[PDB]
Assembly symmetry: C2
């Protein structure tokens, strides 16, 4: 996947916005589509006559290596987009991230 | 996460729906909430003054191991749910899965 909240609500110059569009366009180009064959293999394990948790774990491990590759490459592109921002925009972005994380620690927001 | 399309559109008896609700509520109970501290660690890596791809990869590996544990446990629960279905319902479920995967191999559905 490529969707992120990281840059939500940041006010960009036109030049910043264009560069970020370009960076994301190429990141997408390089990220392969969903590995449908791995989904099918996992489905056939989950529906097997004899459920094989070892086989399931091995298949999850195999799938996670693709996920790691995506996460690393997207971290790189997002770092690059971050480096186009001014110190002031970076500070806004970091504050928004802090407030977003606080939602995951604030029980009253889920009651 | 716990959401899945696996059982979409399957007509269940009341006793099946009840058991599947119970199985999912327990699976949820056992699945810890989002590891906010690891999101924070990754965000600090992505916004570091000197971006460190090795550290990002190590962090993605760590997070991936948690994802593996979730996926294996969810596979077990989903196999248990599948085992409550009749052969007829299983055949419907498998045909629906096949049709869903075909969407990922059919360019005309995305044009």
């Amino acid at each position: 996947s490529t969707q992120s909240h990281m840059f939500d609500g940041i006010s960009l110059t036109e030049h910043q916005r264009q560069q970020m569009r370009d960076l994301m366009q190429q990141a997408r180009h390089e990220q392969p589509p969903v590995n449908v064959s791995e989904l099918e293999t996992m489905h056939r394990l989950v529906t097997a006559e004899n459920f094989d948790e070892n086989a399931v774990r091995a298949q999850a491990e195999k799938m996670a290596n693709e996920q790691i590759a995506r996460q690393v490459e997207m971290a790189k592109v997002r770092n690059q987009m971050y480096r186009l921002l001014t110190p002031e925009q970076q500070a806004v972005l970091n504050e928004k991230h802090q407030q977003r994380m606080e939602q995951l620690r604030d029980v009253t927001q889920w009651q």
